[PDB]
Write a protein that binds this ligand. Structure first.
Ligand SMILES: [K+]
Ligand SMILES: [K+]
Ligand SMILES: [K+]
Ligand SMILES: [K+]
Ligand SMILES: [K+]
Ligand SMILES: [Mg+2]
Ligand SMILES: [Mg+2]
Ligand SMILES: [Mg+2]
Ligand SMILES: [Mg+2]
Ligand SMILES: [Mg+2]
Ligand SMILES: [Mg+2]
Ligand SMILES: [Mg+2]
Ligand SMILES: [Mg+2]
Ligand SMILES: [Mg+2]
Ligand SMILES: [Mg+2]
Ligand SMILES: [Mg+2]
Ligand SMILES: [Mg+2]
Ligand SMILES: [Mg+2]
Ligand SMILES: [Mg+2]
Ligand SMILES: [Mg+2]
Ligand SMILES: [Mg+2]
Ligand SMILES: [Mg+2]
Ligand SMILES: [Mg+2]
Ligand SMILES: [Mg+2]
Ligand SMILES: [Mg+2]
Ligand SMILES: [Mg+2]
Ligand SMILES: [Mg+2]
Ligand SMILES: [Mg+2]
Ligand SMILES: [Mg+2]
Ligand SMILES: [Mg+2]
Ligand SMILES: [Mg+2]
Ligand SMILES: [Mg+2]
Ligand SMILES: [Mg+2]
Ligand SMILES: [Mg+2]
Ligand SMILES: [Mg+2]
Ligand SMILES: [Mg+2]
Ligand SMILES: [Mg+2]
Ligand SMILES: [Mg+2]
Ligand SMILES: [Mg+2]
Ligand SMILES: [Mg+2]
Ligand SMILES: [Mg+2]
Ligand SMILES: [Mg+2]
Ligand SMILES: [Mg+2]
Ligand SMILES: [Mg+2]
Ligand SMILES: [Mg+2]
Ligand SMILES: [Mg+2]
Ligand SMILES: [Mg+2]
Ligand SMILES: [Mg+2]
Ligand SMILES: [Mg+2]
Ligand SMILES: [Mg+2]
Ligand SMILES: [Mg+2]
Ligand SMILES: [Mg+2]
Ligand SMILES: [Mg+2]
Ligand SMILES: [Mg+2]
Ligand SMILES: [Mg+2]
Ligand SMILES: [Mg+2]
Ligand SMILES: [Mg+2]
Ligand SMILES: [Mg+2]
Ligand SMILES: [Mg+2]
Ligand SMILES: [Mg+2]
Ligand SMILES: [Mg+2]
Ligand SMILES: [Mg+2]
Ligand SMILES: [Mg+2]
Ligand SMILES: [Mg+2]
Ligand SMILES: [Mg+2]
Ligand SMILES: [Mg+2]
Ligand SMILES: [Mg+2]
Ligand SMILES: [Mg+2]
Ligand SMILES: [Mg+2]
Ligand SMILES: [Mg+2]
Ligand SMILES: [Mg+2]
Ligand SMILES: [Mg+2]
Ligand SMILES: [Mg+2]
Ligand SMILES: [Mg+2]
Ligand SMILES: [Mg+2]
Ligand SMILES: [Mg+2]
Ligand SMILES: [Mg+2]
Ligand SMILES: [Mg+2]
Ligand SMILES: [Mg+2]
Ligand SMILES: [Mg+2]
Ligand SMILES: [Mg+2]
Ligand SMILES: [Mg+2]
Ligand SMILES: [Mg+2]
Ligand SMILES: [Mg+2]
Ligand SMILES: [Mg+2]
Ligand SMILES: [Mg+2]
Ligand SMILES: [Mg+2]
Ligand SMILES: [Mg+2]
Ligand SMILES: [Mg+2]
Ligand SMILES: [Mg+2]
Ligand SMILES: [Mg+2]
Ligand SMILES: [Mg+2]
Ligand SMILES: [Mg+2]
Ligand SMILES: [Mg+2]
Ligand SMILES: [Mg+2]
Ligand SMILES: [Mg+2]
Ligand SMILES: [Mg+2]
Ligand SMILES: [Mg+2]
Ligand SMILES: [Mg+2]
Ligand SMILES: [Mg+2]
Ligand SMILES: [Mg+2]
Ligand SMILES: [Zn+2]
Ligand SMILES: [Zn+2]
Lengths: 109, 84, 252, 50
RNA sequence: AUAUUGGCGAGAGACCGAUAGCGAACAAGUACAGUGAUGGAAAGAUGAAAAGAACUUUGAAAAGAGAGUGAAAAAGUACGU
RNA sequence: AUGGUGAACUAUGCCUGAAUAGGGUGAAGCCAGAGGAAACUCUGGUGGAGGCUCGUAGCGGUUCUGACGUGCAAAUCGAUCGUCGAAUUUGGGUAUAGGGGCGAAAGACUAAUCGAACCAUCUAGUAGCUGGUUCCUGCCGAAGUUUCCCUCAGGAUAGCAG
RNA sequence: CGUGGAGGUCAGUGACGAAGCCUAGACCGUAAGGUCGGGUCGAACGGCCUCUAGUGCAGAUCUUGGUGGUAGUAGCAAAUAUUCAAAUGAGAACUUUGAAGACUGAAGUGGGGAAAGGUUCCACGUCAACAGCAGUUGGACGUGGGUUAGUCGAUCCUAAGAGAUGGGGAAGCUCCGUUUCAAAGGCCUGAUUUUAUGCAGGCCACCAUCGAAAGGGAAUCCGGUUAAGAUUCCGGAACCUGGAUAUGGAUUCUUCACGGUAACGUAACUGAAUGUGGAGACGUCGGCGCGAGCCCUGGGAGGAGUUAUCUUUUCUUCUUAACAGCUUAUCACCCCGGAAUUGGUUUAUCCGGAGAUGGGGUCUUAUGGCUGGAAGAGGCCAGCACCUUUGCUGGCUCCGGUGCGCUUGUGACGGCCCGUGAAAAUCCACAGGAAGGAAUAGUUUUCAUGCCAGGUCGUACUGAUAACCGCAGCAGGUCUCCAAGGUGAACAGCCUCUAGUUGAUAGAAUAAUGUAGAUAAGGGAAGUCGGCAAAAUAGAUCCGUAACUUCGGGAUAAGGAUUGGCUCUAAGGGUCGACGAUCAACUUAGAACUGGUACGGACAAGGGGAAUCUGACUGUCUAAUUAAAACAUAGCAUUGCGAUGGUCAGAAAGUGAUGUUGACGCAAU
RNA sequence: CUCUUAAGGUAGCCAAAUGCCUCGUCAUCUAAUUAGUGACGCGCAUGAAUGGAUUAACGAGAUUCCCACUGUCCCUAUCUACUAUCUAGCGAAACCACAGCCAAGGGAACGGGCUUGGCAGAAUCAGCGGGGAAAGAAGACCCUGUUGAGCUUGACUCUAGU
RNA sequence: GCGUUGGAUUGUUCACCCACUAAUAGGGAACGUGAGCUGGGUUUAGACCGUCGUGAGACAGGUUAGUUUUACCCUACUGAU
RNA sequence: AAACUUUCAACAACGGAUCUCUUGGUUCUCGCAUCGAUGAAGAACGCAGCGAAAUGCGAUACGUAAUGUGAAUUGCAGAAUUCCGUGAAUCAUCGAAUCUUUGAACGCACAUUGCGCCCCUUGGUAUUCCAGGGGGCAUGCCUGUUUGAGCGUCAUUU
C-alpha cells in the first residue's frame, strides 16, 4: 500500500497536525491536512448547542452572512428557544408579583 | 551512561551569538552574554582575566575613528583646508 | 554541612504551589456600602472543582451597584448551596445557608464559614472542606464576637467581620484512605512538591541532623527548642509533650 | 535545520564564500610569504560552532 | 618640583638571536579545543638575480635519465649549512 | 581565598506536546431465572474495574560474575532478565548554581569532574618530605657523638674538618 | 680548561674561503681541553691582558622536538553473501551497466521531518592527500549551478516563567518588585471649523515588553515541470485579509423584510456607547455506531507471465484534489396526546404527567451521495511515422460485493479521581436604542457581481552502522509521522510484494587454544560456595486443581488427555413478501477416513512443588563494580501554628516561598 | 531473704540477617549435614512505632529439601561458523639501564650478570603461560608529617539568626 | 620404585562422619600454582542486626550485594623448519 | 662459507641540531596629552578586473575630496606615456566628505535582518488603506518656554 508523508514541517501528531489520506486525480495517495473541527455555539443559559446556528471556527463567522449566525427570535444565536421562553415567563410573572407586592405593602399600612 | 551514550543527547544550544561581541556566548535562557556582559551597559572584564582584557581591548579591532585622533592632535584639530 | 530540605523549601524554586488549574483566589465580596448597611443579592451560577482544594468553589454573580455590569465572585461553597440559589450578603441579609453576614448580626450558636479575621479581609477562617466556626457569644460594648475555630481555639473577632452561614462543602474527605502512593502523588501534584518525604534518619549527617550512624536513629532528643535556628528545627519543634495522647484535649 | 534565522544563514554564506583555496596568482607576488590557505574549513573536520 | 608595565612620538643597551626573546620576528591572540567563563599553539633562511630546469628520451602518470641555468643543483621552492 | 561560567549530561518542580500490539483474570452497575413463611439465599448471563497479570514497541539493567577488556565503545555487545496503561516513557520551553542547587536518600546527581563542579587570579601558595643539581686536576679531609627544643625523617649548640 | 657578551691589544685570520659540521688521520696536555691535515661549506671569526654572566648535563616517572627495537608484529573476524560477463580505464574483488543469487520484510536497510550540521544537494573535471585493502568511485579534491510562497512556518497570542517603568534597598557592580503607596490615556465626536483643533459638551484602563518553527492561529488545491526547487515555479481552478467601490438585488407610502402554531427558514433584511454570552478551550480508558484510506474479492475493458500437462488462470491499470451548489446524520428541539396490562430502549439500564411510546416536523453538515472543478488532467493500451524537437492519430479509463479486518477521524455513551484534566490573542452573536434615515424619492458594502494590493526572513540536502553528538566514515546515543500479503491472538518470530541495499579489506587452507552455536551411550548434581551454565516445561481445547487466605487470591497451583491432513455433518445470520425467495461471513461442536502414532511438526513458547529469613504490595537509587532486606509508599502516631502566626528564604528592602493557602490546612518528624 | 534502681525487660520472640562459648542441646532431614527445619532458653548482647509477634499476595532479594531435567561431573568425544595459521595490501601499542641457559655459593639474608662448576653452534615458525621478584599506578593498607579534607560533639575561639 | 580415593556439612586450611580400598602416610617447591581458573571467604564504597558511643561512628561480632585487566617480547617448555 | 648481528668509514637517507644571519622581542631614558550621544572602544556583514587571509575601507566600500611630490603600479590583465602636466602612484600628507547593520546605543523589540507612531513628499480615486523616498519619536538631570494641577494659598468680584 502507498504510504504518505506530512505536507508541513511539523512531524508530530499534534492537534493542529491532523491529516487525512485522500486519492488525487493523479491516482496516488496523499496526506491532506485537516483543520480542527468546529464546535457548535452554545446557549448562554443552559449550555446546549444552539439550533440553526452554523458551527464554524471562530474567525469563519466573519465570512458568513448574518442568517447563518442568528435565529429570528428575541435572543437569536445567544440563547435557546426554551431558555428564551423561560426568560419571558419569569420576567412577566415577576413584574406582576412586583405589582401585587407593591399594592400589598400599600394596603398593609 | 554519562559518557559516550550521554554525549549523543547534546543538540540544544545553551549559548547563541551575542549581538554585541559575536562570540556565541549569549546565554539563551539568561539573555546575558558570558563574555562581554551584554545587555549590561558596561562591557564585562576582570583584572584576573588579563588575557581576556588583552584579547578584547582597544587596538584589537580597526579603530575606525580613534586611529586618526593622534594625527588630528598633531595638526592641532585644524578646521579649514590646505589652500593650495 | 549541607542545606537541609526544610531550609531549601523557603527559596520557592521547586516548592511553589501548582496554581495553573486553580479557579482563582476564593474571597468574599469587597466590604462595601451595600454590605455595611444593607444587603446585596447574587446568584450561584456554577459549583466547580478547584484543583488542589478539597472543597468546591461557588461562582456567585452580583450586580455592581455603581456601574452597569456583573461582578463574579469566587466563594467557598457551603454544603447545601446549589446553582441558581440567591445568596444575600450584608448586615441586613437573612440567616440562611450560603448568606454572608457580619458575625455580630448572627445569634449565638450560629455555624459560619470563610470567616474574616479582620473586617474586609474577605475570609480567613474555616475555609477547608467540612470546617466551620461556631459563634459562642457577643460583646456588644466594644463590639466583638467570640468564636470557636476548627482547631478548637477561642478567638475574639470584630463584630463587623463577615462569614458564610453553614459548613464548608466536601466534608468527610479525609475519612477515605488514600490506599495508594499513586493517589498521594496525584493529590500533591496539584498542590506542591512536598511529597514523597524521605526520612531524615535515612539520610547522611551532611543532609540532616538525623542522618548518619551505624543504625538509623535520631541520637539526640527530637524535641527542638523554639529558639533553635534554621537547619536545627527538624523533628518536633517546641513540643510541649510527646508520646501517644491519652485522655481529654482542650487544656484550660 | 532548514528553518534557520537570517543571522545563521548570513554566517553560513560568509563561510561558503570564504571556503576556497588560495588564489593561484598569489604565490607570484614579489615577497609572498603566503604558501596556502591556512584558514580553510571543511564541514567534516572542524565545526563552525555557529 | 612627584608618579606613570596604558596611549602617541623618539633615542638608546656589556639584553635574547627563532625550544631564546612578549604567547605571537610569519594572514598571532591566528589555527584549534571547550556549552561557557576561558584555554591557546606550531610555523623565519633557494639563489646576486628565477636565471624556478627550454629541448630530447623512458613511463599512464608521479617522476627518472639526459640536456640546460646558475659561482655552486654537495642551492631544485620536500630549497643556506 | 577572590571573582566569574555552567541544569546541551544528570537531579527535581512547573508549562506545553507526544508515545504505549495482542492475550489472561473478570470488580462495581444491570438483565433473566430458582429456592424460602419471612429474613434473605443461590444460578446463568451482561458488563469491563484494577498504581492486576502473560507478553511486543518502549523504559530499565538480574545473571552468565559470557563477549570485549591495546574494545565497536573512557561502560559497549549477546543471551538471560525486571517492567510494560500511570508513582509510565519522552521531546521542547522554563526554574533552581557551588558550601549552593537538587536528592522516592546512593554522599547520589549537578556537561567522562562530586564527601563540595568548572574557569581565571592570589600563586612560582608552603613543604622538617621525594627526585635532580652541569668542567678538570692538586692539597687537606669528617660525622652519625654532648646539651636544648611541640624534638624522635628537623634544627640550634659543642665536637670532628677546611 | 671551556662558553655567550664587554674594554684594550695582535695595524691578528678570512670569498686565493671565516664560522659550523664530518673525519678506527697527526701532534701537545695527567685533564678539563688545545692544535694541525683532509672532505663539506659559505661570511664572518680568533690569540693574548682584563671585565662580565641567563657560562659547562647523563640522569630530575626532567621540558620541547625528533627517532628506534618491538615489527612488517598485534591485528584490519559483530551487522547471513556474494557470483558471471561487458564497458571504462595504465591499472577493476571494490566504478558503471546487464544477468544471477540474497537481505532489510512496512515497529524497514522504505518515504518524510524536528534538533543539529551548513552546501554534505546537483553537474562537470578529477585521484597528491582522506575513505585503517583498493579505487577509474565518493559525504574527497577543483570549478560552477541550485533553495522562487498573501494561503507552509516564523512573524501575532499567551503558558510555566523572564523582565523595564513608578517606587524602595544596596558603598556599588546592581537587587526586589510587575500593578505595585504613580498626576501612567488616546479614540469617538458636538462644537472649534480666526485650524474639525488645544481650550472646551460628552465615553472608557487595577497597565511596558519578552516567552511555543509540537500549544492557540485568516486563507490553496490538482496536474505538469529541474541535473539539483515546489502545497513556493508553470497551467488551471479557489480562498482569506486590508482597502476602494459602481451596478444589480433587497428594503421603505405601515420607513429600518417577510413566512412557519412552533422548533426555526431565507440572498439581503440599519444599529453607537455600554453590557452579556458563545467559540478559541482542552483528561484518560473501555465497548458500540458511522466515515475515509488501506486490505480482501466478483464481472468486464486492456497489457504482461506460465502453458510437456493443468489452470475462464497469476500479476498489473481502471483514479478524481482544494473549492462551490443541491442533498445527507447521531444528538438535540418543536406541534398533536395523555400513558399501569407500564411502555420505549442500549453491547453496556437509562428515559417518560417536569409529558413517554406513536404520528408529523425543525436543526447542527463531522460525514457521505450527485453535479460543477473534470477529463481537457492522470493511468493503461493500440496503429503509424522518426535527420532533429520525437511527432502524433485513435481506444478504454466501467459496474459491483464483503467485514469483531488494519490505520485513522468522528459521534452518542459508560468507568475513574482527596487527579475533574491551560491561558491569551482573535472572531461572532445577543441585550440596548444613541444616531441617521423615504416619496418628481430615500436606506442597505453581514446578498450577488465587479477593482486593487498583500511586504520581510526560512525553503537545497542528511537526519544517521558515513551528512548530528561521542577526538573518527565509532556495533554507542539522539524526538516524531505513514505502514502491503501469508502463517499466526498478535505492530511476536519466519517468508514474500512496493521501495531500498547488496555496504563492512580480500584470497588459500581447516592445527592447537579460543568466541558463538550444537549433540552425546549409562548414571543423573555424585561437579560446585552455590544446579553457575545448560536442559527440561511451554501455544490452544477439555478434565482436574491442595495447604493457606486479608475471601479478593493462591491458580496456568499440582497433575492429566487431545492437537495433522482429507471428506462430510450440525448449530449459530441479513434483506425482501409460519413459510417462500435471495444474499453473505466466520466461529464452535461432532463423525468417518487416512499415515513409519505423526501432527502448538519450522517459528513461537511457564519448569514445578514443601518450607525458612526478609521487605506488605506497585514503585525508586549508587549513569561507570553494590537493585537489596536499602529509599519511597498507603496506613499509624507525635509536634508547631488562628496570620501582629508556624516553618523557611533574603545583604537589605515599601522583599519573598508555603499562599490563587486557613486546622478535613500548611509546616516538622 | 537480703543488697539495690527512675524503672529493674512486661506481652511476645530467639543459637533468629541479633548467641561469644558454639559445629549449644534434643528431634527431623541424609549412608554421612559446621547446612535447612521444628523445639529448648540464667538470652556475651532478643523485645515492643529506636516498633514486638504474625502475616495472604507479591520478589531478577537470601536459604534448605524434593520431583523433572540435563556434559556440572564420572569422562570425555564429535560437528558447524568466525578467528587463530599462510598470502596480497594496510599496519599500531604496551614495554625497553644493558640484556636474556642453568645449579650451588656468598651477597641488601630468593642472580641474567659476581665466584665455582654444568655447559655452550647460525638463522628461525606455531603454541605456551614457569620465570623476567613481567606490565599497568610516586601502595588505597600500616606508620611518620608539628600535611589536609568530609562529618560529629557543651573540644577551643567565634558567628548569621533569634 | 609404585600408589595413597569417592562423598554429606563448612569459603574454609583444619575438623568430623559415611564408604570403598592394599592404603586412604606426612610434607616442600615465594605457607608451589589468580597475565592458569574461580571468587565462596577475607579485605573499599550500599544495607540490616546486636553491643558500645551524646554523636559522627567502632567491633577477629553476625548477615546480604559487590568489574579478577594485558603476552605478539626474551628465556624456559612443547612441538616444527 | 653465506645469510644474520655488531663496530667503523664513504656516499645516500631520516631529522632539523650547529653556525651565521634578524623589518622581532625585552629593558632603560627622553618628549607629549589627544576616545565617546557631533555616537567611542568593540562586533557582524560586505567592498578589488582576477583575493581566502593580513591590512585598508563602507553601497561615494583596498576607497571619494583637498594638499604636496613629480611619473608610476606591477603577479597577470588593463590603461597611459600630453605624461614641459591642476598630473601617475597600493606614494606621502590630510583640514572636506562618505561612513552598511550594530555597539554606552537612543521609538518598542531582538535566538525575529520582528513590530509600531509622527511630519513632509510621491504613486495607486486616497486625510483614514497599501507602498516608495526624505526627516524624526530613549532615559535621568540643569536653565529657560508654554500649557496645567492643588480650598497649599493671596488679592479682587462677592
Ligand atoms: K439560522
Ligand atoms: K543519626
Ligand atoms: K521489552
Ligand atoms: K572530602
Ligand atoms: K630595541
Ligand atoms: Mg558526571
Ligand atoms: Mg537550559
Ligand atoms: Mg509520611
Ligand atoms: Mg519516608
Ligand atoms: Mg544511606
Ligand atoms: Mg549536622
Ligand atoms: Mg542536634
Ligand atoms: Mg546503615
Ligand atoms: Mg618563540
Ligand atoms: Mg631552515
Ligand atoms: Mg656551495
Ligand atoms: Mg628533509
Ligand atoms: Mg534539559
Ligand atoms: Mg507484568
Ligand atoms: Mg547488557
Ligand atoms: Mg564479565
Ligand atoms: Mg583479548
Ligand atoms: Mg555511606
Ligand atoms: Mg621553586
Ligand atoms: Mg689525607
Ligand atoms: Mg616546649
Ligand atoms: Mg630520607
Ligand atoms: Mg648571554
Ligand atoms: Mg672553513
Ligand atoms: Mg666517528
Ligand atoms: Mg651568503
Ligand atoms: Mg643556566
Ligand atoms: Mg641530554
Ligand atoms: Mg648526574
Ligand atoms: Mg625521560
Ligand atoms: Mg618525549
Ligand atoms: Mg597478522
Ligand atoms: Mg577481532
Ligand atoms: Mg559480517
Ligand atoms: Mg566487496
Ligand atoms: Mg551491480
Ligand atoms: Mg531476518
Ligand atoms: Mg527476508
Ligand atoms: Mg553527491
Ligand atoms: Mg585505504
Ligand atoms: Mg590508494
Ligand atoms: Mg565538492
Ligand atoms: Mg499558516
Ligand atoms: Mg528585575
Ligand atoms: Mg511574543
Ligand atoms: Mg502551532
Ligand atoms: Mg527535493
Ligand atoms: Mg500559480
Ligand atoms: Mg425577502
Ligand atoms: Mg417523543
Ligand atoms: Mg465537509
Ligand atoms: Mg496512533
Ligand atoms: Mg525540501
Ligand atoms: Mg529531505
Ligand atoms: Mg530516514
Ligand atoms: Mg562527527
Ligand atoms: Mg487469521
Ligand atoms: Mg548423556
Ligand atoms: Mg540417554
Ligand atoms: Mg532421574
Ligand atoms: Mg555436592
Ligand atoms: Mg565435592
Ligand atoms: Mg557445601
Ligand atoms: Mg540458570
Ligand atoms: Mg497445569
Ligand atoms: Mg504455591
Ligand atoms: Mg519490596
Ligand atoms: Mg503492573
Ligand atoms: Mg553501578
Ligand atoms: Mg548492578
Ligand atoms: Mg524501609
Ligand atoms: Mg521475658
Ligand atoms: Mg537466643
Ligand atoms: Mg532454629
Ligand atoms: Mg545439602
Ligand atoms: Mg533493638
Ligand atoms: Mg518490583
Ligand atoms: Mg640460578
Ligand atoms: Mg643463601
Ligand atoms: Mg634480572
Ligand atoms: Mg662462568
Ligand atoms: Mg598466552
Ligand atoms: Mg611468566
Ligand atoms: Mg609512595
Ligand atoms: Mg600515593
Ligand atoms: Mg615532630
Ligand atoms: Mg582541618
Ligand atoms: Mg602461596
Ligand atoms: Mg602465576
Ligand atoms: Mg588474576
Ligand atoms: Mg590463589
Ligand atoms: Mg565475595
Ligand atoms: Mg562494605
Ligand atoms: Mg545508644
Ligand atoms: Mg576489622
Ligand atoms: Mg558610524
Ligand atoms: Zn438554553
Ligand atoms: Zn557578547
Amino acid at each position: 500500500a502507498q504510504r504518505v508523508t506530512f505536507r508541513r514541517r511539523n512531524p508530530y501528531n499534534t492537534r493542529s497536525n491532523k491529516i487525512k489520506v485522500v486519492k488525487t486525480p493523479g491516482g496516488i495517495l496523499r496526506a491532506q491536512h485537516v483543520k480542527k473541527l468546529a464546535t457548535r455555539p452554545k446557549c448562554g443559559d443552559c449550555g446546549s448547542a444552539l439550533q440553526g446556528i452554523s458551527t464554524l471556527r471562530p474567525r469563519q463567522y466573519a465570512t458568513v452572512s448574518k442568517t447563518h449566525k442568528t435565529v429570528s427570535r428575541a435572543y437569536g444565536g445567544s440563547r435557546c428557544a426554551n431558555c428564551v421562553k423561560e426568560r419571558i415567563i419569569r420576567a412577566f410573572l415577576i413584574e406582576e408579583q412586583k405589582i401585587v407586592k407593591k399594592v400589598v405593602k400599600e394596603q398593609t399600612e | 551512561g554519562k559518557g559516550t551514550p550521554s554525549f549523543g543527547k547534546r543538540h540544544n544550544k545553551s549559548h547563541t551569538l551575542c549581538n554585541r561581541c559575536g562570540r556565541r556566548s549569549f546565554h539563551v535562557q539568561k539573555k546575558t552574554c558570558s563574555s562581554c556582559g551584554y545587555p549590561a551597559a558596561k562591557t564585562r572584564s576582570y583584572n584576573w582575566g588579563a588575557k581576556a582584557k588583552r584579547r578584547h581591548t582597544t587596538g584589537t579591532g580597526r579603530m575606525r575613528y580613534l586611529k586618526h585622533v593622534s594625527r588630528r592632535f598633531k595638526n592641532g584639530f585644524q578646521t579649514g583646508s590646505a589652500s593650495k | 554541612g549541607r542545606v537541609i530540605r526544610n531550609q531549601r523549601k523557603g527559596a520557592g524554586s521547586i516548592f511553589t504551589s501548582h496554581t495553573r488549574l486553580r479557579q482563582g483566589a476564593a474571597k468574599l465580596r469587597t466590604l462595601d456600602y451595600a454590605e455595611r448597611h444593607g444587603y446585596i443579592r447574587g446568584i450561584v451560577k456554577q459549583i466547580v472543582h478547584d484543583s488542589g482544594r478539597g472543597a468546591p468553589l461557588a461562582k456567585v454573580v452580583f450586580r455592581d451597584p455603581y456601574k452597569y455590569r456583573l461582578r463574579e465572585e469566587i466563594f467557598i461553597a457551603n454544603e447545601g448551596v446549589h446553582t441558581g440559589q440567591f445568596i444575600y450578603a450584608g448586615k441586613k441579609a437573612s440567616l440562611n445557608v450560603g448568606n454572608v453576614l457580619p458575625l455580630g448580626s448572627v445569634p449565638e450558636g450560629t455555624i459560619v464559614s470563610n470567616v474574616e479575621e479582620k473586617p474586609g479581609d474577605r475570609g480567613a477562617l474555616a475555609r477547608a472542606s467540612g470546617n466551620y466556626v461556631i459563634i459562642i457569644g457577643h460583646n456588644p460594648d466594644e463590639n466583638k464576637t467570640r468564636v470557636r475555630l476548627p482547631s478548637g481555639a477561642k478567638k475574639v473577632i470584630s463584630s463587623d467581620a463577615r462569614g458564610v452561614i453553614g459548613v464548608i462543602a466536601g466534608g468527610g474527605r479525609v475519612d477515605k484512605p488514600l490506599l495508594k502512593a499513586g493517589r498521594a502523588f496525584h493529590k500533591y501534584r496539584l498542590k506542591r512538591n512536598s511529597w514523597p518525604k524521605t526520612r531524615g534518619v535515612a539520610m547522611n549527617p551532611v543532609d540532616h541532623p538525623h542522618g548518619g550512624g551505624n543504625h538509623q536513629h535520631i541520637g539526640k532528643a527530637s524535641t527542638i527548642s523554639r529558639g533553635a535556628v534554621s537547619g536545627q528545627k527538624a523533628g518536633l519543634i517546641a513540643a510541649r509533650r510527646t508520646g501517644l495522647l491519652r485522655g481529654s484535649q482542650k487544656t484550660q | 535545520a532548514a528553518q534557520k534565522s537570517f543571522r545563521i544563514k548570513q554566517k553560513m554564506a560568509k563561510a561558503k564564500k570564504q571556503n576556497r583555496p588560495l588564489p593561484q596568482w598569489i604565490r607570484l607576488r614579489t615577497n609572498n610569504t603566503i604558501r596556502y590557505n591556512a584558514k580553510r574549513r571543511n564541514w567534516r573536520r572542524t565545526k563552525m560552532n555557529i
